[PDB]
Fold Chaperone protein ClpB.
Amino acid sequence: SMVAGSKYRGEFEERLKAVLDDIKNSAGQIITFIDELHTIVGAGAAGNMIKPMLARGELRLVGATTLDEYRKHIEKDAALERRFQQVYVGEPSVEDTIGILRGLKDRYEVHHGV
Amino acid sequence: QALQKYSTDLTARAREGKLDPVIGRDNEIRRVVQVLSRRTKNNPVLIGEPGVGKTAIVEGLAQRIVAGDVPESLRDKTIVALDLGSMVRGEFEERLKAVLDDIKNSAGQIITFIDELHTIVGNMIKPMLARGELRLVGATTLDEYRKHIEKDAALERRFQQVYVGEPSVEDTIGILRGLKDRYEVHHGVRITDSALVAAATLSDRYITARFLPDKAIDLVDEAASRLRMEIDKEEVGPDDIADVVSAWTGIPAGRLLEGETAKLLRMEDELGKRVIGQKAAVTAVSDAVRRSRAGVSDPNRPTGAFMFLGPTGVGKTELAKALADFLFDDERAMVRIDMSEYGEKHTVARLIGAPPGYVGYEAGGQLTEAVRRRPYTVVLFDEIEKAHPDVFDVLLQVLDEGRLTDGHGRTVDFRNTILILTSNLGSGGSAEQVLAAVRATFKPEFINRLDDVLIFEGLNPEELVRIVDIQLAQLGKRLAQRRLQLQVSLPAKRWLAQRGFDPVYGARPLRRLVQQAIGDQLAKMLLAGQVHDGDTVPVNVSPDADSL
Amino acid sequence: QALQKYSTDLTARAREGKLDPVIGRDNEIRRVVQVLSRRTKNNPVLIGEPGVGKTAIVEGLAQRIVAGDVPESLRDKTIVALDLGSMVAGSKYRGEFEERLKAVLDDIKNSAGQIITFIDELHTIVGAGADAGNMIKPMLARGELRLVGATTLDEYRKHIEKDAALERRFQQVYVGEPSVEDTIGILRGLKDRYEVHHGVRITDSALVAAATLSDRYITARFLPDKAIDLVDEAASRLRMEIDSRPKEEVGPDDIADVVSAWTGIPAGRLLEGETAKLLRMEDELGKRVIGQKAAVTAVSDAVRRSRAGVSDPNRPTGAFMFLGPTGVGKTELAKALADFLFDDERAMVRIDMSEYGEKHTVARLIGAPPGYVGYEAGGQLTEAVRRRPYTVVLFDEIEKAHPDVFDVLLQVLDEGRLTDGHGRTVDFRNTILILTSNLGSGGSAEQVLAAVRATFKPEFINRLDDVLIFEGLNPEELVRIVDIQLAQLGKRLAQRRLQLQVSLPAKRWLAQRGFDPVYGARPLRRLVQQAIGDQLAKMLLAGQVHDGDTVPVNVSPDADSL
Ligand SMILES: Nc1ncnc2c1ncn2[C@@H]1O[C@H](COP(=O)(O)OP(=O)(O)OP(O)(O)=S)[C@@H](O)[C@H]1O
Ligand SMILES: Nc1ncnc2c1ncn2[C@@H]1O[C@H](COP(=O)(O)OP(=O)(O)OP(O)(O)=S)[C@@H](O)[C@H]1O
Ligand SMILES: Nc1ncnc2c1ncn2[C@@H]1O[C@H](COP(=O)(O)OP(=O)(O)O)[C@@H](O)[C@H]1O
Ligand SMILES: Nc1ncnc2c1ncn2[C@@H]1O[C@H](COP(=O)(O)OP(=O)(O)O)[C@@H](O)[C@H]1O
């Protein structure tokens, strides 16, 4: 919805500048979170006007992407990886899945009345 | 002032101290220096496996440069590594144009270092490299050299190959004891000095995927790492290393030490755990194989060349499988060749190979091809007694020198294998008629070169039930998906033992008989009804069959 | 403005002196000029083996143009060196390289005819298609661009000659490699850039030594270049020695040192220390082989003559065949020589002759012709001698191979030549050939010679040197080979501190036993094993004998006991 309507030759640039400066106003409070942060590689005509802001550490920018996709869009440019810290996530096992399902089998009962 | 925005540095980062020590391997540095201080071919490439220390070598050259040991010809220089992840189209090439033009406009001491150049090699660097305004310290793998830089290059004629080999355990321990102070800022413990040598000599033996200098870092750097969870006992040791090495290799922590007396005197009823009875043969073979681990005989001979014969279906092959998986840690380490078709001279060469250009050549010889790979196998010779009298000439120089040449021209090493000449002649007489038949059918010179010629014997009905119980346990492992057991009766066991003897084949029909009745009958049971999960399923003997 | 971000300028690079003094090769420059100064289709191509001076010709032409030494219609032509790789780098679209090349072609043809072109390695001109390297075929056969080229004789007919409409517009200028005297002249001309790149001095004697040596021993490269590597490497090594490390010039000994260290050959001029060992060579070799004094002398004189500088330089260093009774020491002498010459036992290339009873089995040491099963592999012997061209070759027991295998090495002997499937020749010019036999086996010096003359043909005996007859084993010195075997067993018993105290009557009995007069000293090894090693392993595994036990032996009349 940031690039939804923007066609007057500077609109998306100034819009992203404004929202980023809004992020930088309140320091520490707001933890940004972009899902599928590989999409910001292009999306301009972002990605390059967020790097200098990230060189200040003010924004937190927790993210999430798939492993194979990380080394296709993000790991094309090395100036991005210098400010990224990968935390691998493993899939749960059978016992953990049984526990999770035991914890979740109360919402489907109120959804479907059985 | 144009590339720092996009690349790293190993010269300015050397004045800071972020580099680790450079201890050891001082010949390769001088070789690289004298190769780079040339007029032609003045750019070396380091050729070695991964994790051997190429980056260590180049950063050590940089660390020597920063203090000043090189001649003035390459003094007051600076070196930079190339970040290959920055390129990998349209970017692998445009960024390459940009960086090469940056180096051109640097015009001097910007000596580079490309890691894994076998991925970059392709020709746009040749018109700039032949002009001589940049140097290229390379690093890659030998096998990727013969593939890319020998064909895809067209520039191989201006690359020197500086060879880097993995260090030994002694200088590995040296590097380890050199890099122990920096392990007080990331982890804080009192690292012991015996831990380092233990980790080195242990990683060397069993770990195979990695190589020495870096392989000793997935060690104790792991032991000092996984001793951190106990702050939410400050001395690491050989136990705190073995506990992770065993969990790594999946082998239980029993063989952590004593690989010369344990697993050698332990050659006992643990063999009998696999083969039931035949204690005389077990002891004879164990003594013969442990005699060869002394070091008094000539090193060019098989580890054990004994044979044995008698009746079939008693455990001849089973003793072989047990010896194989005990002595070589693998059950599928046998080469069972069948000497029943080698009854002609035009079929003798089928096990050695054929010359380069005739029918069976790429298939290789039937004997040597299985030994070129995994030279730690036992080689069974089924039905040797009826082989044509020309394979004996081959196995003569086999058990005379641990050498043999296949059709390709290669030379195979036999001096650490175990030969077995299974035969079935006789089997009726107690001890003497089989010896007479041996002396009549075999060349008495060959048997003199052979080791013990021990004989097998029949099986006792009391211990025969143990094998039936082994098969019943094998089956019981399978019907656990329904959580069933078997309440087995002694008349049933003895009935199975009598109906699976057939003294012309031995214990061959057990795998079929025990399977058929029990499995299929109880499967029909579970399918129809009258049995559910957790049942006991008692089994007894009907007048003829064994009802459940 | 296009042919300046995609092109260098060789002419303007020659004015700065940033080129090399091309020496000689006048016919090639003359033909390049007279082909470059015609009316239509004036495109020359410099063909030749790799490293024979193809680019140096163009550099010399550039220097000649700068100096004003060309015909009248070649003044101030500013030859330009394109790089077609920097135009196909960034282009992932429809019609990008087409524009990038059309701009250059238009800027060439816009000026007058003084933009003489130079595309090095023009076998890369057929790519970038998808109609590429094909837009210039109109301007080629019209004398619009000159296009001086250069490519390898092998890469020519692999990439270009499949485009017979494109190779019609090129005139092939063949460039062959020079001779030794021409290389000496080139080096004399070039012995000024290295003397200033390194702070050392170089001698004409060293230059001549390099030019002469690199032609005889480095037999897989060509010779304007294989001789400058030696000079450069020797200068670099001597500089690294002279400076920064705790006769100030390179001479004719450092070049030989480089040629010896690299490619592993004792070529040189017999420095000190080797001569001592070569004088004390027969007496030393006689320590591992006892007797045969009439056959050690010939083998030793062969190597002494070879490394003394007096031998036919294009022929093997020795082709001895020695035969005689069984178990006398033929292969043992062969192995002793291989050990004394290389300090290693596996260095020799031993092939048997019991597996070659059949005619078709010769393809193992030759190879296979094109279009057959094993063809990229090659031949066993050829590959084994391509690398390590200094070993000795043992043709063990060459009597069983039937008379068709002899004809193969009939020209290995007397020339040192052998070809494989790929048609490449390998030279056995500095390897000692040795082939044993057992023909005769009982006769005198006139009965076994008849057997040789009957089993071989006159064109085969004529190739090889002295036919040595090994003499029998003299009942006296038999104790010494027993001492040899005992010392070998003792050296084997080194991982422990074990010693031995073998008695004189025990030695006498061990020598008398296992010495069958028809089988020489064959059973002695097995006899020593049976009578020592089994009992020692028993007494070492059953306790009661630990390490350091210098235990003796006795006669024990029937069988040798502890
Ligand atoms: N006539 C000559 N005068 C002086 N130096 C020469 C002469 N011919 C060759 N050289 C030198 O010998 C070496 C041979 O290099 P080049 O001939 O340039 O390689 P090349 O001929 O391009 O072969 P390739 O296959 O392209 S590497 C260079 O150092 C040349 O300077
Ligand atoms: N003069 C000798 N000096 C030392 N060892 C000798 C001598 N003659 C024979 N031997 C030993 O005899 C054994 C076999 O010698 P070989 O050279 O293999 O026999 P051979 O000369 O090849 O004869 P054949 O016909 O080929 S079996 C080795 O253990 C040698 O050490
Ligand atoms: N002589 C040495 N001195 C200090 N560290 C060494 C030495 N040899 C090896 N190492 C260590 O071993 C590791 C090997 O890693 P590296 O050389 O990057 O792998 P690669 O062989 O793929 O370049 C390095 O982290 C280095 O610290
Ligand atoms: N002593 C024994 N210990 C364990 N299993 C045995 C024994 N004797 C026979 N068997 C079983 O009986 C079968 C006999 O088959 P096999 O070993 O091929 O016979 P042979 O060795 O005579 O060729 C094997 O599957 C084996 O599991």
